[PDB]
């Protein structure tokens, strides 16, 4: 009953009328984050409407910005291209900026084993679940968290009312409807 389950959640959220990411009383994105924080053992989560958002958050969150370098030995062609667009070079002397896991229906049930690593930044790409482009950054580094949110226009900082300075920003805000589907998938596939 996949088509039904997806249809029901969409119907549920549409009926509530709360389909804006920036609305008060939007609970779907928090619920999604809370589940992934429990499954992993990470203090902080940031939701994006693109894997690009999660990648930039991880890089900028560790001060890997234009002119800097990092270890791009595990990047696919797409992310190599993004790093180059950001103005970030390569060095094998440095550690990798993140660990990336592509989540699909094949491996969604085993998310607890996947998200239990010794990784500084865990990027979960949920794009292949088929609800739309979506990625979540998980970390214990608060600076990475704060800079990843600040990078988003109308991010956490903008909503709840000269500390962490924003530079270039993007709309990586995730659609609640999309978030609600992923949240349902996680619950349905035994991740509490």
């Amino acid at each position: 009953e996949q088509l039904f389950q997806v249809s029901f959640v969409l119907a549920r959220v549409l009926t509530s009328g709360i389909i804006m990411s920036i609305e008060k009383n939007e609970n779907e994105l928090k619920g999604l984050e809370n589940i992934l924080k429990k499954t992993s053992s990470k203090q902080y989560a940031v939701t994006f409407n693109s894997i690009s958002g999660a990648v930039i958050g991880s890089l900028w969150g560790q001060d890997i910005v234009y002119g800097e370098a990092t270890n791009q030995q595990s990047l696919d062609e797409q992310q190599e291209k993004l790093f180059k667009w950001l103005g970030i070079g390569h060095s094998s002397l440095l550690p990798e900026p993140y660990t990336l896991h592509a989540i699909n229906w094949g491996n969604i049930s085993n998310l607890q084993k996947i998200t239990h690593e010794e990784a500084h930044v865990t990027l979960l790409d949920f794009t292949k679940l088929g609800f739309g482009p979506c990625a979540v950054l998980l970390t214990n580094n608060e600076t990475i968290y704060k800079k990843s949110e600040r990078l988003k226009i109308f991010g956490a900082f903008d909503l709840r009312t000269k500390e962490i300075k924003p530079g270039l920003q993007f709309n990586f805000r995730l659609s609640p409807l999309v978030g609600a589907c992923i949240k349902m998938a996680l619950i349905k596939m035994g991740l509490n």
Binding site: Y66, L82, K165, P166
Partner: protein
């Protein structure tokens, strides 16, 4: 079930309430507290059913279906659906031929995303003042801002009013500049009967759930005039590795919403026009100016306060604004400001970090921006009121007339407005 359905219908307001005591002074409000919610978007059975249709199709088909359907309506030759308005503006700029180190002239009054799209295109925002009536990029101030580094001009159809495309396109041809529209408020807005988004070499447009034409969360679309620009945009996506793709969930809501857009638009148009006509008879308020050739979409309805009335002698304009905000809010009309700070004075354009280390701002000569450079914009901010959700929502007659009664009520109490404004503390 959890639903947003409003259980209390708006009663027809008594016109005698024009004579009533102000609610700020303990009077009965024009709009009761139970009648202050407006639902937006207008989610109907069609939207739910549409999800059950689109869920069965490949996600890419749903997205391209939406993009094609909306493109045909807008009449743009080419279109790319995106995850957001911001990203659509980025692709629009790049597609049109904006490159690293180029300057792009942009209004100082707009949402941050307009300017962040320029920076993402690795170009330098060059902020300009607005026309005091249209609130759009002033074409008279383009000769002052143009340099050898200028490549494009980026007008915003702010509030839903078309910018002066005739004057801006004239300037662009003379100076061999590209023209990039931000049509994020201007869904269904026309100039000479042509839709905003088809005038510039390219255009971006937010399709967020708070826009007159809403998709199911976050979304946008880029329009291109020539195939060359469309190709360059697609090339950039291939080369950059950015994933700016739209969700099918968002797209699906768009498909159904688009079938009812003309209906909702018609209500918006009649409502806003009636309000303009009614405000015209007041001493204190004037609705937004609309050139003959333009059709306003009325995403936001900006009202000019007559701060030059003799009752307001020696009262700062900003106190009149604050007083009227308080008074109107007590009556049940939520007149707030959309944008309090001009973009030059937002943190990103003060620190100018960009991608890091000041890129791409350091590619060109810096500019120290001062408040003196934007008098019309600042004049707007301290002498104007904005209705957003009130008139974006295609409200019923009783609600529309409730607004009319409110403004007429306040207009009868100009002396009392002056007194309240006087007693507001100085704000440095």
């Amino acid at each position: 079930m959890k639903t947003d359905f409003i259980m209390v219908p708006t009663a027809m307001p008594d016109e005698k309430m024009i004579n009533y005591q102000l609610a700020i002074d303990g009077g009965e409000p024009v709009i009761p507290k139970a009648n202050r919610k407006t639902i937006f978007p207008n989610i109907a059975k069609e939207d739910l059913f549409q999800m059950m249709i689109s869920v069965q199709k490949p996600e890419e088909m749903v997205v391209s279906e939406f993009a094609e359907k909306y493109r045909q309506r807008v009449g743009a030759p080419y279109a790319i659906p995106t995850a957001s308005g911001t990203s659509s503006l980025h692709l629009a700029l790049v597609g049109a031929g904006v490159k690293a180190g180029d300057e792009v002239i942009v209004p100082a009054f707009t949402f941050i995303a307009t300017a962040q799209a320029i920076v993402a295109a690795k170009a330098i925002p060059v902020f300009a003042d607005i026309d005091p009536q249209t609130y759009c990029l002033d074409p008279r101030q383009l000769d002052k801002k143009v340099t050898a580094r200028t490549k494009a001009v980026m007008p915003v159809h702010v509030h839903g009013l078309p910018a002066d495309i005739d004057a801006l396109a004239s300037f662009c041809r003379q100076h061999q500049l590209a023209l990039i529209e931000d049509a994020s408020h201007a869904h269904s807005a026309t100039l000479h009967g042509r839709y905003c988004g088809t005038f510039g070499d390219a255009a971006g447009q937010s399709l967020m759930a708070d826009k007159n034409f809403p998709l199911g969360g976050e979304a946008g679309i880029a329009f291109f005039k020539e195939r060359e620009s469309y190709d360059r945009a697609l090339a950039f996506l291939e080369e950059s590795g950015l994933d700016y793709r739209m969700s099918w969930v968002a797209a699906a809501f768009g498909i159904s919403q688009l079938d009812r857009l003309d209906y909702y638009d018609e209500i918006r148009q009649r409502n806003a026009q009636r309000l303009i006509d009614e405000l015209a008879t007041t001493r204190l308020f004037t609705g937004p100016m609309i050139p003959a050739a333009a059709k306003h979409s009325f995403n936001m309805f900006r009202i000019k306060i007559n701060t030059a009335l003799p009752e307001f002698k020696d009262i700062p304009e900003y106190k009149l604004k604050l007083a009227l905000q308080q008074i109107l809010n007590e009556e049940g009309v939520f007149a707030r400001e959309w944008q309090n700070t001009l973009l030059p004075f937002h943190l990103p354009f003060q620190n100018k970090k960009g991608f890091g280390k000041g890129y791409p701002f350091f590619l060109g000569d810096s500019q120290e921006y001062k408040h003196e450079h934007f008098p019309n914009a600042l004049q707007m901010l301290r002498s104007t009121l904005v209705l957003c959700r009130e008139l974006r929502s295609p409200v019923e007659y009783e609600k529309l007339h409730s607004y009319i009664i409110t403004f007429k009520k306040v207009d009868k109490n100009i002396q009392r407005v002056a007194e309240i404004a006087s007693q507001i503390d100085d704000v440095p």
